[PDB]
Design a protein around this ligand. Structure first.
Ligand code: NAI
Ligand code: NAI
Ligand code: NAI
Ligand code: NAI
Ligand code: 2H3
Ligand code: 2H3
Ligand code: 2H3
Lengths: 340, 340, 340, 340
């Protein structure tokens, strides 16, 4: 039949997932919707046709006619919400990060384990991106030999700095590497099958020095050594002049590849007095639209066919963990072991 | 609130539209199907859950519980099936070209006129393509000035040679200019708002002699002059070694642009002993997947909203007319006025 | 040893060649020079080290210690100046076109053949271009199979429009197709080994109203059929907004190539709010600096080795002839046979 | 007048410098050559017309008829050869790196200062590269704002692996960082005007067993922090499957640029069954041919015109200083300070 879904969270990404499930995802019905903001639930109802609205997640979980939940609430809320819906026997989708505190994660990683009758999936959608999957297949086919180095760039567009400042001046966290680099960590683990041993990170505020006063970072770089001495390089950022730069390079013994060497918007190339111009993708909903739909449909399908997707809490744990180590290494300006 | 659709044709493109309608197109349901190949209908029943199968189009429109038809039969059958379905009070989507005979088209267009309450939409899917649309927007905003020249390439992949030969020998395709270049003719018309005045076409078979034996042209080239002296160049063919080469260049007074200068498959760049490699899109279902989906949903949405899409019988007529002039100019090896 | 060379003509291109021979050309020596200028030669005199100034090739070729001339005088003067030096017993380099009147050209062709001890070289410099040569080697190696179509663009930069008008309004030379398209004709003959049978050309002025006033063509396009039904497409123009667009595409039975698909200036890529930008080459001395140098040196080496370069009067003849055929097809707006 | 030049070293690069000097460089003559390989000196006599040959450097500088020397001997021999040539009254060009020991360089630095009337130029040829100069121009013109990060890759071709092993096993190279990464260090300094504060470097051998045997690193990666907190990333290696990968990326407050994002060979694009192919430059002689010529002529002109080029022992010392730090960091696998 049709998988009834109650979503929690209708911010930036909530609205995308909401809209997709409602209108694009087959075998799916967006039945419930939770938010502490009434306007969103009114948008939910008088735009997507949502039936049961709530202001408390558990309220949604106990009374709603749903089989599964999409957790698109802020990070600090994920772990209790995952435990809570599993306890109510819901299948669970949670956005990244899985959570912030390791202990809690380790704890939730068993609740999920003890509910092996329920599907759990984490929102590392890059795993579903056609381009990443294309490369992943090349690597698995042995087309570049053995991986020696991965470089991954995740830089937010400068058009977003305005609202990042202001926000940064009103609130804090989760930090540059926990916001931007955790997808890269997962991409690194996915491709190599290895784990990260130690990291060093540096950072710089140069476009907007005021970020020094707000305890935030505009640009960051890191070097990592994996457990098998495979090398990794990261850049994270918030000030990309050209758009949304997410690029992943993989160097091997027999070749080399790059996924979005440049963030090509489409098949159009423009020529004018500037020279040869290629328009670019501008933000994550644009760049990763396809990936979001594919992860959404994967979840549903994993429930109907009783099949594991393969993105586990362990992947969530190690993501958050390595992210934290980058942050710590930045603060200390020194090398940090991930296991500590 | 839900459109039951009957499709005729389940071949190279028929199987795509069907699959799309049954599984991805909202407020639509693939209710019926028609094909002269029994294995295909078996496939519709089993894999797509299609209710009603027929081997006669006239039979489907009379007896199926449908609200609309998708015409994906070979080109020589289009006009008969449009009129029939119209006369049966069903909404009509027809693939290109609209027909192969001008006289018959004119007649069909007047039948469409009597039924000014039924929707008619032609399958010039390029108008729905994200990249083409983007370029259109650019041109509309004045980014390249006024158009001076359009060059358009539409070249089928060498790897599809066998499947083409089967298509080409199972029914009249109308030839290279009517089967391929008609997309380009429509693009030129879409972009300039002008009509083609006179043309000269040349051709050549050099790679695949089997095409001659099927009376099909392997590679064609043409020069066209529009009514306002806007210039245009076309190339069509059946032998692109690298994949599906569909490219449109628009030259203007203040710049120029190219749509799929090269048929980039994705965001993956590969580097090895051959050099820098970009994988390519391989065929129309891959390249134009999005477009096909968009035109399908636009067709369906037009029925529910009672508003026209703008791809008209007149666009079909004028396309076919120019295509026939290219064919004629090819046969005569001389300039031909579209007026004749 | 050292080849002693005298040059006639020292304007836009003349100053390039002379400056090259003096300073970068090996086993060669600039000695003589001639022009309608005391000036420009006033320039030549001082910071080139030009000893001898004249106003008559004949006057100039009379007293000088040289083995050879290098003809960079205007079109009309080539031939008469060609025979004179051969009448003087010198080896000869001349620029394109070889001349402008067919019967005249056919005459000189008889002469050159009668001085089978002397070197005659024509300045189709694209033959010495590293990129053109690379493509030629690929084609000759069978990498693309047999050539079915060649498309060639030669569009001058819009930034050069005022200097063009200045140049043109005061001294005609010699039409668009004859000025721009002749290199492309020569490239087509070079790669194919074939000759052009019939052509049709059209044209448009839309961007720069001064060209109307000057009686010049802004953009032209042409289709050509070669003697073996090999296809060819040409565009020439004066309004390339992005730079100097000289591109040549070669489609074959097993592949296709593009020489300067876009005119990349260097290895630098720029990324900003416009998107991804490739700076471009701006004019012919930039783009073909290497070619010009290589043709100068080949000529010299040709003397020293007594070995013929292979760019003949016949290549000159067929170039002007095809260019004249294009010009006539533009004027008449009909197909023209090259043999007329 | 003519600068009589004597060269030491006729290996991988020495044969190129020699050939250029004798055949391409104005106002210069390759009078003398020194090498520990007799077959090499013959080749100079037979092929380049070198009058005086030697097996010992001191020998050449005492007894040859020269004004200046090019030092292209292995790196551990540079400093003693610079000093010896200076004492003998000769101008000096030395290849990179200037030396391998800091105290020695400081001493050689003081010797250069005592002969301030003689020219000293170090062979950081990238400073002369047209594409690097263009990027430097853009940066100086504010086109990308202030520099936040430089990533630089220098990865030798896998095809050159045999020639490398000969080079590395015949004399001490100094390791990957002193031999390769030093170019990038200089670029970072040239662009930023700042010095490197601290580094961490890691490394891996995975493809070619000979390298470990020869005590060489196959691929290295490094994070550096400069004195003003400007970030830097390095990768160097000996196993690039696609060609010679020398790439330099500059990230800024207002934009970003890439020098040789990929090492495009020329203007030719190839299209076939593998997709879209760009051929690549294969090795240093190819990629930096122009640079090498420019620095040679710059050296020679500096002697004739008595104007300093501006690439100094201090540039040498600061580069060797940072490279050693990288080496130590690699060996210890921990952060190192350049000062201490
Ligand atoms: N997959 C990806 O690439 C990305 C994932 N994320 C993850 O997004 C989650 C959503 O982020 P945003 O939409 O940007 O945040 P947000 O602030 O934009 O929206 C949060 C949603 O929070 C709901 N919410 C807040 N407190 C709640 C509560 N106590 N109970 C129920 N709902 C509550 C808000 O009302 C709203 O419904 C985070 O895990 C974020 O990191 C965000 C961006 C990208
Ligand atoms: N928009 C586009 O890019 C494309 C459009 N097309 C158009 O789609 C149409 C279908 O082409 P393909 O699918 O390649 O052809 P095909 O040869 O693969 O399939 C034809 C289908 O029509 C059926 N058919 C044949 N004669 C029939 C009749 N008298 N009554 C009912 N059904 C009949 C066959 O059973 C088969 O199912 C053509 O007009 C073609 O021009 C095709 C490919 C791409
Ligand atoms: N190979 C190529 O791609 C190119 C070839 N050319 C050709 O090179 C030649 C020079 O063209 P431009 O430099 O553009 O011309 P220009 O406009 O610079 O004039 C060139 C020179 O011709 C001289 N001249 C004019 N009338 C003369 C006369 N009666 N006797 C002696 N000298 C006279 C002028 O003094 C001037 O010094 C032409 O044949 C031109 O078509 C030009 C551009 C590119
Ligand atoms: N700027 C650049 O991009 C490049 C710089 N280099 C630098 O140039 C230098 C030469 O490297 P390669 O030519 O690759 O080395 P190589 O090993 O290919 O050539 C060495 C040459 O030096 C001679 N030689 C060795 N020991 C000698 C001694 N004690 N006295 C006199 N001659 C001696 C050998 O006979 C041979 O002719 C190195 O310092 C290297 O770092 C090398 C290649 C590229
Ligand atoms: O029918 C033709 C269609 O118009 C094209 O888009 C497609 O590429 C061809 O294969 C079809 O024959
Ligand atoms: O003489 C023309 C030359 O052939 C072209 O290449 C160039 O672009 C034009 O400026 C010249 O007029
Ligand atoms: O000495 C190294 C030089 O600096 C590089 O440019 C070259 O690529 C290497 O092969 C050399 O060893």
């Amino acid at each position: 039949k049709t998988i009834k879904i109650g979503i929690v969270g209708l911010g930036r990404l909530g609205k995308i997932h909401a809209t997709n499930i409602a209108t694009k995802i087959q075998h799916a019905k967006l039945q419930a919707a939770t938010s502490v903001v009434p306007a969103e639930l009114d948008w939910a109802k008088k735009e997507l046709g949502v039936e049961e609205v709530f202001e408390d997640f558990d309220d949604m979980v106990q009374h709603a006619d749903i089989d599964a939940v999409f957790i698109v609430s802020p990070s600090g809320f994920h772990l209790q919400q995952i435990e809570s819906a599993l306890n109510a026997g819901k299948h669970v989708f949670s956005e990244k990060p899985i959570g912030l505190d390791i202990e809690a994660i380790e704890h939730t990683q068993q609740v999920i384990a003890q509910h092996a009758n329920l599907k759990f999936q984490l929102g590392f959608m890059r795993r579903f991106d056609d381009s990443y999957r294309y490369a992943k297949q090349l690597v698995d086919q042995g087309k570049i030999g053995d991986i020696t180095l991965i470089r991954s760039y995740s830089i937010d567009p400068a058009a977003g700095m305005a609202s990042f400042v202001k926000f940064a001046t009103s609130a804090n966290s989760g930090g540059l590497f926990l916001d931007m680099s955790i997808h890269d960590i997962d991409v690194i683990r996915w491709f190599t099958g290895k784990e990260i041993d130690k990291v060093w990170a540096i950072g710089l505020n140069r476009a907007y020095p005021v970020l020094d006063k707000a305890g935030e970072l505009e640009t960051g770089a890191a070097l990592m050594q994996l457990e098998d001495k495979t090398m990794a390089i990261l850049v994270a950022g918030r000030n990309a002049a050209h758009g949304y730069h997410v690029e992943t390079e993989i160097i091997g013994t027999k070749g080399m590849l790059r996924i979005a060497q440049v963030p090509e918007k489409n098949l159009v190339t423009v020529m004018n007095e500037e020279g040869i111009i290629r328009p670019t993708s501008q933000n994550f909903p644009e760049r990763f639209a396809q990936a979001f739909l594919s992860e959404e449909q994967a979840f549903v399908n994993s429930i109907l066919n009783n099949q594991d997707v393969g993105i586990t809490a362990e992947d969530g744990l190690q993501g958050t963990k390595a992210a934290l180590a980058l942050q710590e290494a930045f603060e200390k300006n020194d090398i940090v072991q991930v296991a500590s």
